[PDB]
């Protein structure tokens, strides 16, 4: 399979399954993509430079593994209990995108399973992340600014060029992670799991 | 020259009356030392403090270049402003005691100034350091709780094997200092300048944890 410059109808792939196709400057906004699953798939063009606009899809427990994403444009998502694995998603947008459950509790809560991916530069700002599989990424240069992701579990994370102090990491596990410029004097790390080698690392920071 | 197994009460000390010599095993209740010169002078097994008058002496502006305490029992001493460059209190108990203005500074031999002083073993609580310069210094295994250090400087000091329970970090300055084997208290790495100073092991685990790691 291998679409190139469609915009896609709201029926056409829901709940359906998709292996090693390619989805080229494609336009997903709108559609319904509940219980979706790509496999092998790719949604970024090289020669073309873009990728495909995913804006306000319904997402609801869609699935994505071994997938190009980049420059995916998933702003203003429902995304709930959406799972994202071992997949390329450099430069997406995820400002808007809901993994929150508002409907069966009175309040709110999170689901979501994003691991083993690539989410250099991807911007989450203001996003809600709570207690969610955040395990495994590269977040080298994403934009975090007003999000948080409070009590998930970021463990084996790779944090080169990242602002700690943008977002909420209160209760997240950073174990076995690359750091970067973490600062444990600026940056409330109440509740985090850390790891001995990173303990001392951070120490040696402090001049210590 | 030496004395021994003397017991003096309420005098007053000559400037002379015991320069270079040394002393053991003997006590003078509220004697004041004050501008004595006691250069060289050993003091071994000795008791300024009387548990009955609750009174110390008066060190005040002596002159303590190479003075020796040693096992004494120095309980609210008054050094304030002496000198007391090259000095050594081991073993010895000093609550209370008032180093206010005491220059452990040497500011000929140099251009500018540098630091002597050896206080190790000894029992420091209550103790008054506000605005001692007190750098690069023996200062190991004594307890510090509750002294006051506003405005002191231990800086490159080797503090290690100490006692520091009710003690105000952010006091003083304690950059390049050695702190290990130490009971820290209540330090936070967040608020106090730890630039070059050393600690264990067990230590750093237990500064992460108040932080809540």
Redo the contacts between chains.
């Keep these: 399979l291998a679409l190139v410059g469609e915009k896609i109808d709201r029926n056409r792939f829901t709940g359906e399954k998709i292996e090693n196709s390619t989805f080229f400057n494609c336009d997903f906004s709108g559609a319904d993509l509940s219980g979706t699953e790509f496999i092998g798939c790719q949604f970024y063009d090289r020669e073309s430079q873009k990728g495909c606009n995913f804006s306000r899809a319904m997402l609801k427990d869609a699935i994505f593994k071994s997938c190009d994403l980049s420059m995916a444009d998933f702003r203003n998502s429902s995304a709930l209990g959406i799972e994202i694995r071992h997949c390329r998603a450099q430069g997406a947008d995820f400002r808007g995108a809901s993994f929150m459950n508002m409907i069966t509790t009175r309040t709110w809560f999170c689901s979501a399973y994003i691991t083993n991916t690539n989410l250099s530069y991807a911007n989450f700002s203001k996003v809600v992340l709570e207690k969610c599989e955040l395990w495994e990424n590269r977040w080298i240069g994403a934009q975090v600014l007003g999000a948080t992701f409070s009590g998930s579990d970021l463990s084996g994370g790779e944090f080169s060029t990242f602002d700690w102090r943008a977002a909420n990491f209160?209760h997240c596990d950073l174990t076995n992670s690359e750091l970067g410029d973490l600062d444990?004097?600026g940056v409330d790390?109440?509740?985090?799991?850390?790891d001995?080698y990173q303990?001392?690392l951070?120490?040696e920071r402090?001049?210590?």
């Design positions: 209160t444990i004097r790390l109440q509740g985090v799991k850390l001995n303990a001392s951070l120490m402090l001049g210590i």
